[PDB]
């Protein structure tokens, strides 16, 4: 939950051991790797934790 | 989109008095022999 | 049914040379394609099974009255067993063989402007199987060498990698390439598995199964030619000879 | 889907040959595909862009800033005409100023077309022997080629007959009225709640109701050049007398329809707009398009349905639409047309009359099977939206034969009954609207929004700004054709002249078949009541002992800026004469050859003024009385 | 040059 | 069945790659600009404008001299852009008023009918509210377009102006005068690559009413969209102000395009906006990248990427074809998202044709599904849940431009004198709404011989103290002209008689929120009406007390919903011919009788 | 019957070896048009010059 | 303004 | 008519 002035950035660390992680959200959201441009809002993401 | 004629005599002459009349008349003659076969067959076998 | 039974490039090309163009077209009006329909499949469901009509089904469908429609009907006949409804083409074109239409300039048809992208899209290629795609690529190759568009054919294949992997390897002017080819192009045949008399949900699958069960009936009927039993009864013109080659090849 | 054998006969049964052959396929980038017609209504790019060009033409010729600046002067001039109560035009009313702007622009274009027809008739009569030679000798050639030959053998001053040539030579007063430009930035919806104060009326007098705004936004005027009318006239004419009769017959019909178009805005009802229905799926296997044409300048509409390769049409009356359906009863049938088809609706404005639209529809229906779907749509949409004749010469010839038939006395549509009935419907609608508005709001408010002064286009007392390009000895001549008249009664003509000089003398002359009048005046910035006329039931006038159907008024003035001619009927709602036909126009004949004679004000003398006949003057020098 | 502008310009110069 | 000829006749056409299709467009825009704005008229009226500006009492360092070539060129560009933007705001305010009148029917339309397309819903709403313009098609918008809303044409403004005047080591008065007459080569290059875009409220109602379910939501969306558009236009004027050459859009195509392997690259550089778009079309795959126009410390024009949609290679080799976009960055992004989603069921020709037509001619695609998705994405990009945080980017664009202005001037002040730098890079031309500007009002309403000229006061994107003045030119030697300012509580009538000279009417103060206190009530905008007999020209001037007034944060959807201001009172008029002395002042509506806002009664 | 002998660069056509463009391609969209033979183009091109 | 019209109005004003 | 023209003409006429 965000109660500040503007949009915030949350860092997720899933480790390096798991093969795939699937992220689903209650509402569409944006996720991207560190120091990379953000994409349009989607519902589900598939990620490789070693990324 | 076709015309109707009272007889085959009017039909064959009208096509003759038209552009490419010679080619038209050749087709109309074949239709005539076909119509003659149709008359004999249908009179023999009414449906 | 006869066209779908050909299993080699030699047999398929030989059949296309013998058959005329009137077999590729159909005189039944049919329906229109690309229409969402509800069909009845009672062996599986009580409700109506949704599906979409296409040009690849084995049922005759209304087709456009142009060269694009004529080529789509020829490829549909090769890959599905039935063509489309394009009437009043003319007896001069209808007498000639399917191969002659595809690879001869003497017929008079102009096919240079044809684009393989929309033809593959219209003749739905995402719904074809491996054997159907190979036959379509044969027709594209024959057309391309007819109008001298070999370079365009190569670029189209390079754009679509899966098509390149299964593309048959033969030069349309050389008969040695047809002999050496060992692709399997048969869509119907005697099945090693157990083929039953049951319906399939899709329009394409149901029609394909009807052709498959029909071929089994024809295979065991009196119209089939058993070479091992009556090879001396065929005429000398149509007897299988290695010296035999396609005309002009 | 069709090939031909080499060394075969090139003749074909069909007379109209499609650019795409029997195979119905044209290789893109070839010459045949380049000369193919383009869809203007269906294509969004061409329809969007076409409106841009038409808007530019209207704005370049008529400027909104200029019209607003001249409102004060026009109001003063219209007040200078001392008109009986219940007949004055008060330009301070917002609604009354609007209708004058539409009327003035529409009348000027119609008036200019009549002038051009008059010179054309003069040139034809001058070369009677050679005109009759061309008409009789050549009959197998196309109507366009015959029109070119006629315009060459005469001093037509406009030799080109093509659409590009017609647009090249066209005056600023001819460009059609573009409705949306007139109604831009104009107040709508003044709310005065139970206030009869003089200030409350003044602000309400300054606005218009929303119904008038819709009418203007769906208004476009049609004016047919005399060069386009010559092809239908010369397609079956055997003599110059027959040809002149056809030319006058067509313009009489165009005269009546243009008057009807203005009355639609005056009545106080929303005029419908033409539209096209296309299927939702652009890449549809089964293609159908529907066209519903609602000509504002006319009395009969047309619905054209093209289903596959079959063309069907229906002509319907624009009066009597009491029910919820827009279409009235159908007068001519050409198949079954379904107006309930669902799809995208695209609105367009026609630039051809109902007769011209109907003429092409019959021609296309005759050649439904010979032409491809693209050619049928392209030719129809080009003519309707651009007034562009088809490139197919065989198709063009058939259209003009049908155009002649619908105009001639053997027409399947009896236009006089429908034009008369539309007039009765319009006046009944105006009466119903006025009394309906009289109950809802006050009688003063009703007169503000729906005025009873205006009524018909030529019944309304309008002004025509004149343009002068000929100057002789420092005196510029301004021309104005008096007549013909569609109504009978007493009519007054006035002239207003503004010039830079503090004092000056300007001369006005009125030419008949016998001689001129030679009035001389010196007043400025005020109408002068130059000449007064009376009109018979048949539309003829006994001017100085001779029956006349039209006169030429010429105004000479030095260093002038603007000359305006005003016109007003004595009684409101002057009754209309019967529209003339081919028989009426050839029954009687008048000579307009005398209208080109001009005088030199600089060399005029006192004894020269007055009514003088041609015998008094010598050969040439129509200014000096001594022979 | 408009009619109204000419009329008022002449009136201003004369009166 | 069909032959297939009609389908090819209605296919979209490439209007950028086709050189025939680029020449035709450029001619029409040039013709449209010259007809409405003439170079002869503007140049001749230069002296009249110069005396008007000077007659306004402006402190030193805060006054503009149109005697300078650069100051004059900047003003005509500013006046043209402001007039078009101002006209759109009045149209929007009128549209909001009609919706509020019929909120009951509008609410029913927004709720009951949801299966119809965006265009169909807009047409039903426009018909119900009885708006002046009832057409949502491209042709209808073009037909019902005022003279002032025509986009400004770059090369037309820069035509025939002296460039590159050389005086050497001279401080003489005459040399200064000849130096000021010319303009620098940089400003000429900027004007040659400048084209403006002003979107109509009818075009905005489709995105606004695609998901709305209440009249308040529909009104709030309309206000939120136009807040972004005005901020983007303000950035556009500031870009030409600083001493930098603006980048201009181009398309890269193969030198020898192949039939079956062809690729297209589009680089959109919206002059009115803080972000750009790069779109690549290879095969049936579309990839887009949204970059930031600020920064760009390196030689490459593109800044950091703020939204990714794939990999776009901007280093491709091919022919370069140049164009100016008629759509905003939001509209271009909205279409490229819909095209990406619907790339499978569209052909190559449809993908290129639909994209080029929208960017170059502001033409929406004829596909119904494509249009619905485009407007759904347009609403998302301008809402509070947008993938792009606009307020951050517009703010960063402002700081980047001011930094460039300082370093460009300081670089020149070293190379030449202070006077030379000042005449080439003015400090009084910062921002479109910050600068002192004039509005040539037009009037088509005459009440009892009095022509009415309407003007919209605000809304304000800057805070401080503002001053408004009028210049009235009338053919008569002596006249009496009135100015009426309408608020919510009541209107204020003043009477003046001075002619051919600016006269201050209103002194206003606006706070951080952008809301002024007009006679004890908070207002966000006011209406000024001027009544003159036989007027020839009426101009309204605006200026801020301090130079470069600080900015006011742009308002999003929730800001517009929170505060509601009534605009119904802007419609009523007064009749000056029936005015009295006792009726001249600030009076409220409860004083007046019903329907007569002229006499106190 | 004139032989200039001037050196000329080789031209690569948009149509290809078949010398005819493929339907619905980028090349067919950028092919030159005939502005004289087509009446719609010629009738227009008169209008713009008159307006100018 | 046209040249003739300017000359004409200047003549009116002076004389 | 322009603003600068009107101001010049009024000066000429009134003087």
DSSP for G2-40?
Answer: ------------SSTTTTSPPTTSHHHHSS---TTT-HH
Q: Which residues contact A21 (CB under 8 A, 6 or more apart)?
A: A14, A46, A47, A48, A49
Phi, psi of C154 (to 5 degrees): -65, -45
Q: Residue F544 in contact with residue F433, Cβ under 8 Å?
A: no
Task: Please give the DSSP secondary-structure letter assigned to residue F107.
Answer: H
DSSP H/E element including D284: none
Q: Do F262 and G29 touch (CB under 8 A)?
A: no
Q: Tokens in use for D610?
A: 């007055």
Phi, psi of F589 (to 5 degrees): -75, -30
Give the count of beta carbons closer than 10 Å to the beta carbon of residue F593. Answer: 16
Neighbour subunits, H (≥3 Cβ pairs < 8 A): D, E, I
Q: Distance between CA F293 and CA F269 in Å, rounded?
A: 8
Task: List, as one string, the DSSP characters of D422-439.
Answer: HHHHHHHHHHHHHHHHHH
By the CB < 8 Å criterion, does F478 face chain I? no
Beta strands in F380-515 (DSSP E): 437-441, 445-447, 450-457, 464-474, 481-486, 490-496, 503-510
* Residue D549 exposed, middle or buried by CB count within 10 Å (0-12, 13-18, 19+): buried
3-state secondary structure of D176: coil
Query: Cα–Cα distances in Å, from F439 out to F19, F288, F470, F529, G16?
Result: 38, 40, 10, 13, 57
Q: Residue F535 in contact with residue F446, Cβ under 8 Å?
A: no
3-state secondary structure of D305: strand
The label of the residue with tokens 């006499």 reads: F599
Torsion of CA F227, F228, F231, F236, to 10 degrees: -140
DSSP H/E element including D547: strand D546-548
Q: Residue D144 in contact with residue D396, Cβ under 8 Å?
A: yes
Q: What is the largest CA-CA distance in chain D?
A: 91
Q: Tokens in use for F296?
A: 């760009």
H residues 1-15 closer than 8 Å to I (CB): 1, 9-10, 13-14
D residues 427-486 closer than 8 Å to B (CB): none
- For D118-168, the three-class secondary structure string (H helix, E strand, C coil) is HHHHHHHHHCHHHHHHHHHHCCCCCHHHHHHHHHHHCCCCCCCCCHHHHHH
DSSP H/E element including D313: strand D310-317
Q: Residue C71 in contact with residue C114, Cβ under 8 Å?
A: yes
3-state secondary structure of F239: helix
Q: Distance between CA D107 and CA F446 in Å, rounded?
A: 25
Q: Residue D232 in contact with residue D128, Cβ under 8 Å?
A: no
Q: Distance between CA F357 and CA F389 in Å, rounded?
A: 28
What number of CA atoms fall less than 13 Å from residue F527's CA on the CB side?
A: 24
Pairing of strands F535-544, D463-466: unpaired
Q: Distance between CA F250 and CA F323 in Å, rounded?
A: 6
Phi, psi of D323 (to 5 degrees): -70, 175
The label of the residue with tokens 């605009």 reads: F567
Q: In residues, how long is chain B?
A: 47
Task: Please give the DSSP secondary-structure letter assigned to residue A1.
Answer: -
> Left, alpha or beta for D469 (phi > 0: left; psi -120 to 50: alpha)?
alpha
Q: Which residues contact D609 (CB under 8 A, 6 or more apart)?
A: D518, D519, D520
Q: Residue F502 in contact with residue F470, Cβ under 8 Å?
A: yes
Phi, psi of F282 (to 5 degrees): -120, 115
E to H CB pairs, distance under 8 Å = 9
Query: Cα–Cα distances in Å, from F260 out to C115, C164, F287, F511, G28?
Result: 9, 15, 19, 61, 11
Q: Distance between CA D185 and CA F445 in Å, rounded?
A: 9
3-state secondary structure of F228: helix
Phi, psi of F400 (to 5 degrees): -65, -40
Q: Which residues of E touch F476 (CB under 8 A)?
A: 8
Q: What separation, in Å, do the N-terminal and C-terminal C-alpha atoms of chain G show?
A: 42
Q: Tokens in use for D30?
A: 């070839």
Among D316, D267, D259, residue whose Cα is nearest residue D485? D259
Beta strands in A1-51 (DSSP E): 21-29, 42-47
The label of the residue with tokens 């129509």 reads: D622
Q: Residue D544 in contact with residue D611, Cβ under 8 Å?
A: yes
By the CB < 8 Å criterion, does D282 face chain C? no
Helix and strand totals (H; E) in chain C: 11, 4
Is F in contact with C (3 or more beta carbon pairs below 8 Å)?
yes
Among F273, F263, F265, residue whose Cα is nearest residue F234? F273
Give the count of beta carbons closer than 10 Å to the beta carbon of residue F52. Answer: 21
Q: Distance between CA C86 and CA C101 in Å, rounded?
A: 15
Pairing of strands F285-292, F275-282: antiparallel
Among C136, C137, C90, residue whose Cα is nearest residue C109? C90
Pairing of strands D288-293, D300-307: antiparallel
Closest-CA distance of chain C to residue F261, Å: 7
Q: Residue F345 in contact with residue F284, Cβ under 8 Å?
A: no
Phi, psi of G8 (to 5 degrees): -130, 135
Among D518, D478, D524, residue whose Cα is nearest residue D505? D524
Task: List, as one string, the DSSP characters of D461-526.
Answer: --EEEE---EEETTEEEEEEEE---SB-EEEEEEEEEEESSSS--EEEEEE-SS----EEE---SS
Residue from I1, I4, I12 whose CB has the most chain F CBs within 10 Å, to mutate? I4
Q: Distance between CA C54 and CA C206 in Å, rounded?
A: 13
3-state class percentages of chain I: helix first, strand second, coil last, to nearest 5: 80, 0, 20
Q: Residue F154 in contact with residue F323, Cβ under 8 Å?
A: no
Pairing of strands C84-85, C61-62: parallel
- From the list C68, C115, C151, which residue is nearest G25 (CB)? C115
Residue from B16, B19, B26 whose CB has the most chain D CBs within 10 Å, to mutate? B19
DSSP H/E element including D30: none
3-state secondary structure of E3: helix
Q: Distance between CA D339 and CA D42 in Å, rounded?
A: 18
Please name every residue paired with F145 in a beta bridge, in sequence order, or none if there are none. none
Q: Distance between CA F214 and CA F173 in Å, rounded?
A: 66
Q: Residue D338 in contact with residue D305, Cβ under 8 Å?
A: yes
3-state secondary structure of F492: strand
Q: Distance between CA F592 and CA A29 in Å, rounded?
A: 55
Q: Distance between CA C54 and CA C49 in Å, rounded?
A: 16
The sign one gets for the Cα dihedral G33, G35, G38, G41 is: positive
Q: Distance between CA F253 and CA F255 in Å, rounded?
A: 6
Helix and strand totals (H; E) in chain I: 1, 0
Among F461, F502, F506, residue whose Cα is nearest residue F485? F506
Query: Cα–Cα distances in Å, from I11 out to D501, E4, F537?
Result: 20, 19, 17
Q: F10-43 burial, b for 16+ CB within 10 Å, e for fewer?
A: bbbbbbbbbeebbebbeebbbbbbbbbbeeeebe
Query: Cα–Cα distances in Å, from F577 out to D18, D445, F100, F531, F598?
Result: 70, 20, 32, 10, 10
Task: Please give the DSSP secondary-structure letter assigned to residue C97.
Answer: B
Give all strands of the β-sheet with F503-510 in edge-to-edge order: F437-441, F535-544, F464-474, F503-510, F516-517, F522-523
Among D608, D591, D607, D611, residue whose Cα is nearest residue D599? D608
Q: Distance between CA F50 and CA F54 in Å, rounded?
A: 6
The sign one gets for the Cα dihedral C247, C249, D4, D6 is: negative
Q: Tokens in use for C137?
A: 């690529």
- For D48-117, the three-class secondary structure string (H helix, E strand, C coil) is HHHHHHHHHHHHHHCCHHHHHHCHHHHHHHHHHCCCCCCCCCCCCCHHHHHHHHHHHHHHHHHHHHHHHH
Torsion of CA B34, B35, B40, B43, to 10 degrees: 140
The sign one gets for the Cα dihedral D542, D547, D552, D558 is: negative
Task: Please give the DSSP secondary-structure letter assigned to residue F339.
Answer: H
Q: Distance between CA H14 and CA H12 in Å, rounded?
A: 6
Q: Which residues of E touch F451 (CB under 8 A)?
A: none
By the CB < 8 Å criterion, does G46 face chain F? no
Please name every residue paired with F409 in a beta bridge, in sequence order, or none if there are none. none
Q: Tokens in use for D43?
A: 């294509």
Give resolution, Å, one decimal: 2.9
Query: Cα–Cα distances in Å, from F417 out to D194, F60, F243?
Result: 70, 19, 16
Cis bond upstream, residue C203 (ω within 30)? no
Among C138, C131, C10, residue whose Cα is nearest residue C74? C138
By the CB < 8 Å criterion, does E1 face chain F? no
Q: Tokens in use for C193?
A: 């598995």
> Left, alpha or beta for C137 (phi > 0: left; psi -120 to 50: alpha)?
alpha
- For F41-79, the three-class secondary structure string (H helix, E strand, C coil) is HHHHCHHHHHHHHHHCCCCCCCCCCCCCHHHHHHHHHHH
Angle at D531 between CA D530 and CA D537, to 5 degrees: 155
Q: F420-444 burial, b for 16+ CB within 10 Å, e for fewer?
A: bbbbbbbebbbbbbbbbbbbbbbbb
Phi, psi of D109 (to 5 degrees): -65, -40
Among F317, F325, F361, residue whose Cα is nearest residue F139? F361
Q: Which residues of D touch E14 (CB under 8 A)?
A: 502
Q: Which residues contact D68 (CB under 8 A, 6 or more apart)?
A: F443, F444
Q: Distance between CA D456 and CA D390 in Å, rounded?
A: 35
G residues 6-35 closer than 8 Å to F (CB): 12, 14, 16, 21-30, 32-33, 35
- From the list F41, F48, F477, which residue is nearest I7 (CB)? F48
Among F412, F503, F410, F518, residue whose Cα is nearest residue F457? F518
Please name every residue paired with D345 in a beta bridge, in sequence order, or none if there are none. D277
Q: Distance between CA F539 and CA D302 in Å, rounded?
A: 50
Q: Tokens in use for F149?
A: 């809303």
Give the count of beta carbons closer than 10 Å to the beta carbon of residue G35. Answer: 14
Q: Residue F598 in contact with residue F531, Cβ under 8 Å?
A: no
The label of the residue with tokens 């100051």 reads: F71
Q: In residues, how long is chain D?
A: 627
């Amino acid at each position: 939950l965000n109660t500040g002035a503007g949009a915030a950035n949350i860092t997720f660390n899933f480790g390096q051991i798991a093969e795939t992680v699937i992220l689903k959200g209650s509402v569409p959201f944006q996720l991207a790797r560190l120091n990379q441009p953000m994409p349009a809002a989607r519902f589900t993401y598939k990620l490789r934790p070693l990324d | 989109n076709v015309n109707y004629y009272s007889s085959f005599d009017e039909f064959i002459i009208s096509q003759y008095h038209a552009q490419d009349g010679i080619n038209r008349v050749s087709t109309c003659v074949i239709l005539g022999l076909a119509l003659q076969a149709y008359d004999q067959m249908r009179r023999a076998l009414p449906v | 049914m006869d066209v779908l039974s050909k299993g080699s490039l030699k047999e398929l090309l030989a059949h296309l040379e013998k058959t005329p163009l009137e077999e590729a077209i159909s005189y039944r009006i049919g329906t229109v394609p690309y229409q969402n329909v509800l069909i009845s499949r009672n062996e599986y469901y009580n409700q109506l099974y949704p599906d979409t009509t296409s040009l690849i089904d084995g049922v005759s469908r209304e087709g456009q009255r142009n060269v694009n429609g004529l080529i789509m009907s020829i490829i549909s006949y090769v890959v599905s067993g039935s063509g489309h409804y394009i009437p009043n083409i003319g007896f001069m074109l209808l007498r000639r063989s399917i191969l002659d239409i595809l690879t001869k300039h003497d017929t008079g048809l102009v096919t240079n402007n044809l684009n393989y992208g929309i033809i593959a899209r219209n003749l739905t290629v995402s719904k074809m199987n491996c054997e159907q795609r190979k036959r379509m690529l044969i027709c594209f190759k024959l057309l391309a060498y007819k109008d001298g568009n070999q370079n365009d054919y190569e670029i189209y294949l390079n754009q679509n990698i899966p098509l390149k992997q299964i593309a048959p390897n033969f030069i349309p002017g050389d008969m040695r390439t047809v002999i050496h080819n060992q692709d399997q192009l048969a869509i119907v045949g005697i099945p090693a598995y157990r083929l039953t008399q049951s319906t399939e949900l899709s329009i394409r699958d149901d029609n394909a199964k009807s052709y498959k069960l029909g071929y089994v009936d024809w295979y065991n009927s009196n119209s089939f030619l058993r070479e091992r039993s009556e090879f001396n009864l065929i005429r000398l013109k149509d007897r299988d000879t290695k010296y035999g080659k396609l005309n002009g090849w | 889907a069709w090939v031909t054998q080499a060394y075969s006969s090139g003749l074909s049964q069909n007379s109209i040959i499609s650019l795409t052959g029997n195979d119905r396929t044209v290789a893109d980038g070839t010459f045949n595909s380049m000369i193919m017609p383009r869809a203007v209504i269906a294509n969004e790019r061409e329809h969007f862009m076409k409106t841009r060009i038409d808007k530019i033409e209207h704005d370049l010729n008529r400027s909104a800033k200029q019209e607003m600046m001249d409102r004060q002067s026009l109001a003063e001039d219209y007040n200078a005409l001392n008109l009986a109560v219940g007949q004055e035009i008060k330009l301070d009313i917002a609604t009354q100023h609007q209708l004058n702007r539409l009327g003035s622009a529409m009348y000027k274009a119609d008036h200019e077309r009549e002038t051009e027809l008059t010179d054309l008739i003069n040139r034809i009569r001058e070369n009677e022997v050679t005109v009759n030679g061309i008409l009789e000798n050549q009959k197998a050639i196309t109507a366009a080629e015959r029109a070119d030959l006629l315009l060459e053998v005469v001093a037509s001053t406009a030799k080109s007959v093509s659409a590009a040539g017609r647009a090249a030579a066209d005056g600023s007063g001819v460009v059609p009225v573009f409705g949306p430009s007139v109604a831009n930035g104009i107040k709508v919806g003044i709310d005065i709640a139970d206030s009869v104060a003089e200030a409350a009326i003044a602000v309400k007098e300054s606005g218009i109701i929303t119904q008038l705004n819709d009418v203007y936004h769906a208004f476009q005027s049609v004016h047919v050049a005399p060069n386009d009318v010559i092809k239908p006239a010369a397609v079956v004419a055997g003599t110059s007398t027959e040809l002149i009769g056809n030319l006058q017959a067509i313009y009489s019909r165009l005269r009546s329809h243009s008057d009807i178009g203005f009355k639609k805005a005056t009545v106080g009802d929303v005029i419908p707009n033409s539209y096209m229905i296309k299927p939702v799926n652009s890449t549809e296997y089964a293609s159908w398009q529907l066209y519903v044409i609602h000509p504002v300048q006319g009395s009969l509409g047309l619905v054209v349905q093209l289903m596959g390769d079959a063309l069907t049409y229906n002509v319907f009356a624009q009066y009597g639409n009491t029910s919820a359906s827009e279409f009235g009863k159908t007068v001519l049938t050409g198949g079954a047309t379904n107006t309930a088809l669902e799809g995208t609706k695209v609105k367009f404005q026609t630039k051809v009359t109902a007769q011209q639209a109907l003429a092409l529809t019959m021609a296309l229906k005759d050649a439904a099977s010979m032409l491809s779907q693209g050619e049928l749509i392209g030719y129809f949409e080009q003519y309707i939206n651009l007034a562009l004749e088809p490139d197919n010469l065989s198709l063009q010839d058939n259209m003009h034969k049908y155009h002649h038939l619908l105009t001639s006395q053997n027409s399947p549509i009896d236009w006089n009954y429908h034009d008369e009935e539309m007039h009765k419907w319009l006046d009944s609608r105006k009466t119903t609207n006025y009394d309906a508005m009289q109950k809802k709001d006050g009688t003063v408010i009703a007169d503000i929004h729906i005025p009873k002064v205006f009524n018909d286009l030529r019944n309304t007392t309008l002004h025509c700004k004149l343009e002068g390009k000929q100057t002789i000895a420092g005196y510029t001549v301004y021309e104005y054709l008096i007549g013909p008249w569609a109504h009978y009664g007493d009519i007054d003509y006035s002239v207003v002249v503004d010039t830079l000089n503090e004092e000056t003398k300007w001369y006005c002359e009125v030419i008949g078949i016998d001689g001129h009048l030679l009035i001389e005046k010196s007043v400025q910035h005020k109408p002068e009541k130059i000449l007064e006329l009376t009109v018979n039931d048949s539309g003829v006038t006994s001017f100085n002992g001779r029956n006349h159907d039209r006169l030429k008024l010429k105004v000479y003035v030095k260093d002038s800026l603007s000359v305006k001619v005003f016109r007003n009927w004595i009684g409101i709602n002057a009754p209309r004469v019967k529209t003339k036909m081919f028989n009426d126009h050839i029954g009687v004949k008048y000579d307009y050859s005398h209208f080109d004679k001009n005088i030199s004000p600089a060399h005029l003398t006192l004894t020269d003024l007055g009514w003088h006949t041609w015998d008094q003057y010598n050969a040439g020098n129509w200014t000096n009385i001594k022979p | 040059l408009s009619e109204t502008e000419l009329r008022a310009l002449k009136k201003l110069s004369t009166t």
